[model samples]
Every structure is written in structure tokens, then in C-alpha cells.
Target: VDSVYRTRSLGVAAEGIPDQYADGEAARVWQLYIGDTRSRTAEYKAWLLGLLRQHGCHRVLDVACGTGVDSIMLVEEGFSVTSVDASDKMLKYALKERWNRRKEPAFDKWVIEEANWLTLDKDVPAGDGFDAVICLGNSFAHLPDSKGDQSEHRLALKNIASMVRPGGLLVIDHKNYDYILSTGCAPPGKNIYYKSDLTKDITTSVLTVNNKAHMVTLDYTVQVPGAGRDGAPGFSKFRLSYYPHCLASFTELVQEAFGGRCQHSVLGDFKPYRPGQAYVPCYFIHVLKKTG
Candidate 1:
């Protein structure tokens, strides 16, 4: 048995998302998590174009733009794109892409700022109100422990809702925790399993369900070149824990905090989400609108 290697996955998450993007491993793992940037980009681009058009949205805001990947896509599509993230490391990557662009695929409204979405109205200027806000990549769950500080969570959602102008929309995505955490009547998302990969880099992440805690944990073990395996060399093993909420609870929370401030509905893979339509290994999208 190899001792786990705990590397600098995020020396800054103590600062909330601590320099995770600054760490090269974060980028590499993300790349592995979502393969084929080309196809992914294409699919995301098409999806954004249609989403923006479908909602009659022009201005865009990426509240938690991870590495600014999708922000770049939206900019390339000529949407007035403004990106904000809590991590300077992530924003740095985004800036590299935006600032290094050419005149041909020219963009006039490319903006990147370091701000927490939790305090959108206070931190982000009102003049910057957007027609659409995009928070994807399951980034919403970054809030420490789902059940821990729901007041803060509700406040955060209120801020997010306030960032959008009247009739504006907010597009957010989250894992079907309802399925994983068993919310109300949604089916179980996936079977509990323990699998490890020791081919090149030893990777281990096991799904853990603790129904009593209202939480799911991903316990990870890693054997690397230098760290974990006594004989082998590697970096670290990262474990993650976050509260998962069902769609019913999720929507109810949003609508309640939003105070009829907006109208929203759950969206499926690419369509309106319906009861019992929970899919395994896929994410659920919530497209919320600001009431006029």
C-alpha cells in the first residue's frame, strides 16, 4: 500500500479557490476530465450561440469562468462577453487567450475581472448589468459544504439574480445531485463503485454516498512519480466533498430567494428538464430569467 501524496492542488483555496488554476495539475486534470477541447469547444460554441439567440440575449457574463475557456468561445462568437472569477490564476489564463487575439476575429467588448459571484451587486458595478449570466462547469457547488451555510448560499443566489437586468437570464449548471443525493423522487444517478487506474499515474476516486449527511464525497488516492508510491514518483492525491441538492430543492431555493424576481425552469441535456428525466453521468442546466 502506497502512502497518499498530497500536493499543492490549491495552496490558495484557503483564499477560496486558492490558486488551483495557478497550479498546472489543475489545468491538466481539467483537460483530462473533459477531453477533446476542439469538439467540446464546437459543441459548447453551438450551444452558446443558440442559447444566446434563443433568449434574445446580447451581453454575457461568466460569473465563474473556469480558465476562461467558455468566455473565449463566447467572445469569438462576437457576444459582448465579460468574465469574472474569484481566482487570479484562472483569470490569467483567460487574459492570455483574450489579449493575444487577432484583429480579424476582432472583439471589442472582452473584459475579465477578479470578483466573487457571491457579492455580485456590491463588487460588480451596476452599469455592468448583463443580459445573460453563464455559470457552468458545476461551479455553483464550490460553496463550502451545501448544508453548512445555506444563508450565505441564498444570499449568493440573490446576488446572482441581481446581476441580471430585468427580463435578463442566468444560465447555470449543476450535477444532478438530486439523483445522486436522492432528492424527493429523482432516481439514483449512478451505482457506488470503487475503481483505480494505475497505468501511468495511479488515479483513484471512489463515489461515496452518505444519505444521512445529505452529502456525497469523492475520496481520491494517487500514486505518482515522487510522492505516493514509495518506489514510484508522483505528486498528490486530492479528495473532494460538496453538498448535492435535488432539482426540486435547488429550484425551490432559487425561486424563494429570487422572490418572484425572475422566472426559471430546469433544462435537460438540451431541452426543458422534466420530472424523472434525470440522466446518468450528465449535468442539469437551470436557465433562470429576471422578471420584468
Candidate 2:
């Protein structure tokens, strides 16, 4: 028999998310695991709300909202929010959490939509312009495939530009390519751990790069021990690629796609205007303004 290696599918399972991320106790466990990063949550919301207020935004859209953690925070901060994600399972978990809290009144202020960020329609009722829009949580890295071309990134920016009212803001957070490159390749056999309801282990290694684009390949061997029936372990492995884009590259792309009127910023330490001094070097946060 030929050796078999699990493959990470490029692009999210956008349409078949519910099927792929099947609901039930196991799925919920995984959701909690992914959402358990408190530091990421706190910093993201703090920076986001500050940006919204700084730009005088009252309404917001969170594209690729995942489990809707940031969406809930935006509502708590008094911003009218519309949250969109491609995964129905993830959306289901978010909506259920909202319902359990009986925050229906808050629900009245929020609209949750399941849609792909790349092709969002600006004219849909929930889609009709917002004062601010955000895409965070390293979600943008999943937009492209091994090829490293940024068609998906371009499409997402275009969609975000269409959804922002003129002079409104679009804030995006992504992995800092320069920082990753500076660190060189991650070591082999390193274990990444996440826990919420249950523990998950990922044995990760940096694979060879796509020389032309300098894209890095990350291989993951994910093991979900004690997750299956009879306490048997369920395990899977996959590989994904990411092309790190510099701060200037993202800003230039936004300018080219939406006209040269957008503003850019790098966020770390929850400060919006501080570009070169952010504490965390792995992420870059950009704020772009729609210009006429």
C-alpha cells in the first residue's frame, strides 16, 4: 500500500462547512478549543473597538467572524454589528450561545449571515454599507492556497471596500510576513496545544518553501485524544501554505483596488496608531478608509 498523508484543503469548506465541521459534542469541543485563546480575544476586541471609535464608526461588519467572539464584543461596546462566516457549524455555535444567554434584544442589534467573504454583495440588506468592517484572527491567511497569488485577498478587500460607507473604515489583521521570515523556519516536532472542552495536540513543522513566492508550508499532525467513542484517539494530519505580505504590500493593494485614499496601521499591544512599536510582532493590523 502506498503511504497516505492527509491533505489540507485550500480555501475553507465554505459551502459544506456544516458537513465538514459536523455538529454534536465533538464539534462543540473543537470550537471551544479554537476560541480559548483569551489573549488573542482581548487584544483583538480592544484594538478593534478603539479603531471604530477613533474613526467615528457606529456600525460594523465582521467578515469571517468564525465563532462570533469579536462580534459579541462589538455589540457589548454598543456598535451595531453584522457578523458573517462561511461555516454553518461555527455560526450555529455562536447563535446558540447568544440564545442561551437570552440576549435576544442584543440579537435585534446584530445580524448574522453565512456567506463567503470573497464575493459578498454590497446591496444585500444586511450587506448594505457599514461604518466599519473587520476581518481578524489570522483568518486572512486561509484565504489563499499553495499558489500564493492573492486573488482571494484582492476579492476580500474589494468586498470590504464595497461594504464600507464612503469615509468609513476597514480593519484587517493578518500574520506579519516579515516577522515570520526573520524568525527563519520553525523547528520540527514541536507540539502546539489547545484546550477548552477537550485537549488537542498538533505536531507542527516548517516544510519547504515555494521558492518563487517565498511562501512557507506548515504541516500539522493533529491528534484528538479521548475524543472518539470508547476513548480511542482520533487523529489527522494536513499541510497548509501561507504567503506573508508586508505592511506596505497590503496597503498598496488596498490603495490600488479602492483608490489611493485608504489609511494603514499596524496593531500590537492593543494600540491603533502605533505602527512600528507594537509588542506582538507576528500580526499586522491595517485600517483603511473608503475614499470617494
Candidate 3:
């Protein structure tokens, strides 16, 4: 095994960290890659805000709140939000970002906490239910149970769903693994998942695709300008893993987790998803309503 891969595995074993972000390089890469608000376009913002408003959601629980972008945005938008993530490595970036606004009391509306998805309700101190719960950034696929069976994924879904009040929403997203599975490669990286300007020149290649294991691995190599004094670009390499999920199967899993009490709709790249559309979305956003 390579040194980087070996080091990440050690981190995973010692701290229950994800293999990809074990060394924090991937986190930094993510920061440089999709950490900014520019990664979120007007259409994406409008679609999300419109959905939240349409559902009358104010108090929100943001699970898998990597780097705190959405959580901070929600706070600024006047929504009380609790940002939670299992990865301490990932949460550090979010905390650092939050620290920048520590002087503002309004930013206090955003709570940064560390908790795993399966035990979210117990770990998070927020009592009662929230108006909505969001698990964005396609981070749900990082569930460790995805490597074995979907039991953990189901429990994670149920745990998050339990935090949403009746008639509230649970918004989640996934990479269109269905497309990747069919084509053996992912769609473009921009516009949907990683909407960073740096994505235009970043070199990402499929490292591994395990159909039986339902996992996909990718290697990313990016060049950062001015990191080297000689006017040469500095390069960073990151290996990331994601579990593959077809929309149909994942939807069934979600329905079962919510015990058939939720109504579901999907948006592809911030627009209503219709079959046979000319453009296939790189990501799928699922809006599920927890009904009475």
C-alpha cells in the first residue's frame, strides 16, 4: 500500500474516520475545491430556499454538514440550524469558518457539533423536533455500513427523520450513481456537486469502481498557483470513496426507514427531474416530507 493510503487507514482505525479524509488533505482539497459560496449557484440557492420557505421550515438540523457552508447560509437566512458531522477532521474546517463570525450574535443561531448519523438524536442536545433536517453534499454515502450492509444507512436515515417534526422536511442528496453504474464513470464534476471554479481545471480520474461492493473511488490531482515560489504550481493528490446507489433502490430504502410516512420528490440539479431529459444530472436532491 502507498504511504498516504496506509496513513489514512490508520486514522480510520484509530478514530472511526473516513478513509478519504483521514489525513485532512482531502478536507483541505474539499475546501479549495467546493468550500466557497460560489460553488452554490443562484439556481441552487433559489431551489433550496424556495423549498424551505414552501415547507415553512425555520428550525433545521443539518447532518453531514461538512465545512458548514449550508448551515452558515441557513443561519444568515434567519433559520436556526444545528450543524452536525461525524468527522472531526471535516468539522474543523466548519469550526474555523464559524470562528470568523464569532463576534456576531446572529451567527450564534448556527450550532456546530460533532455527532454520527446513527446516534444523532442522542448525541445532539437539541430537544424535540426541528422543522426540517438536511443532509446535503452527497455525504450520506460515506456511511460505513455502506461497506457491509445498508442497515447503518437505514438507521442513519431513521435517526435523522426522527428529528424532523410532522409535516417537516428531510432534504438529502446523492451523486447519480445510477448513471455512473450504467456508464462506468461519473458525469461532470461542475454545476451540481462540486460547483467550485477550481473544478474546471482539477484532474479527477476514476480510481476504482466496485460494483459488488457498491463503492466508487476516485483520485484527484489539483494544481494550486503561488504555492511554489518559483512560479510553478503545487500539486495535491486525494483519494476519495463513495458508495453507489441507484435512485430506485435508495428511495425504497428511505421509504422503509421512514416507515412509509414520508412523501418524496426529487430535483435533478435544482430542477424537477423528469424521465428521458436530455441532460442527466450529476446529483439528485431528495426532498422528503415527514407526514402525520
Clashing pairs in 2: none
State how far residue 258 of model 2 sits from its true place (Å): 1.7
Q: Which 10 consecutive positions of candidate 2 have the poorest summed lDDT?
A: 189-198
How many pairs of residues collide in each model? 10, 0, 0
Question: For each candidate, what is the lDDT?
Answer: 0.65, 0.64, 0.75
- Cα lDDT for residue 86, candidate 1: 89
Per-residue C-alpha lDDT of model 3 across residues 33-100, encoded as one tens digit per residue:
55543456677678788889987888999987877877877888888788898877668878987888
Error of 1 at 265 (Å): 1.2
Across 43-88, the per-residue lDDT of candidate 1 in tens digits comes to 4556768979988888888898767777777787778888888876
Sorted by lDDT (best first), the order is 3, 1, 2
Local lDDT at 171 for model 2: 74
Q: Tens-digit lDDT track for model 2 on 59-156?
A: 88888677777787777777788898887667886787667765567766677878886668743454447888788666776665434567777877
TM-score of each: 0.71, 0.71, 0.83
Q: Judging by lDDT against the true structure, name the best candidate.
A: 3
